[PDB]
Amino acid sequence: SGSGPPRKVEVEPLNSTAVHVSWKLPVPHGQIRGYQVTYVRLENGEPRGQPIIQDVMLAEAQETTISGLTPETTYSITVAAYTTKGDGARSKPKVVTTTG
Ligand SMILES: OC[C@@H](O)[C@@H](O)[C@H](O)[C@@H](O)CO
């Protein structure tokens, strides 16, 4: 509502407990104050447990590392901007599974 989604979200695995998430600026709305990276464990494709929100509270932000993940575990990741007119649209989920 406050903005379109972050564009070209990418996930790069780092190790069995961490992945690197990056994105491009939403299409130029409210003014961007930061980004909300949300991830949730999936079990057989279904979300399980509370989603975890990692705030990246720089308007210039375009990346963050999610760490403390469990090995051999599947996660669904979305990104949304925080704006002066409320949350932006969330990106479509990107789903990855950590190595062993
Ligand atoms: O489709 C993959 C499967 O559901 C698995 O990766 C779970 O996320 C993991 O077993 C968590 O216990």
Numbering used by the authors: 707 to 734, 738 to 809
List passages from the publication reporting this PDB structure.
An understudied class of proteins in phosphotyrosine signaling, the receptor protein tyrosine phosphatases (RPTPs), are a family of single-pass transmembrane proteins whose architecture include an extracellular domain resembling those of cell adhesion molecules (CAMs) and intracellular single or tandem tyrosine phosphatase domains. The ectodomains of Lar-RPTPs resemble immunoglobulin (Ig)-superfamily CAMs and include three Ig-like domains followed by four to nine fibronectin type III (FN) repeats. Surprisingly, we uncovered a tripeptide, Lys-Gly-Asp (KGD), in the Dlar FN5 domain that is similar to the RGD motif in FN10 and is conserved in the Lar-RPTP homologs across species.
We thus determined the crystal structures of the FN5 domain of mouse LAR and the FN4-FN6 fragment of human RPTPδ. The LAR FN5 crystal structure was solved by molecular replacement using Dlar FN5 as the model and refined to a resolution of 1.7 Å, while the structure of the FN4-FN6 fragment was to a resolution of 1.77 Å. Overall, the LAR FN5 adopts a structure that is very similar to that of Dlar FN5. Thus, if Dlar and its mammalian homologues interact directly with integrins, they will use a mechanism that is distinct from the canonical RGD/integrin binding interaction. (C) A ribbon diagram of the FN5 domain of mouse Lar is shown in cyan. Residues in the mouse Lar KGD motif are shown in ball-and-stick representation.
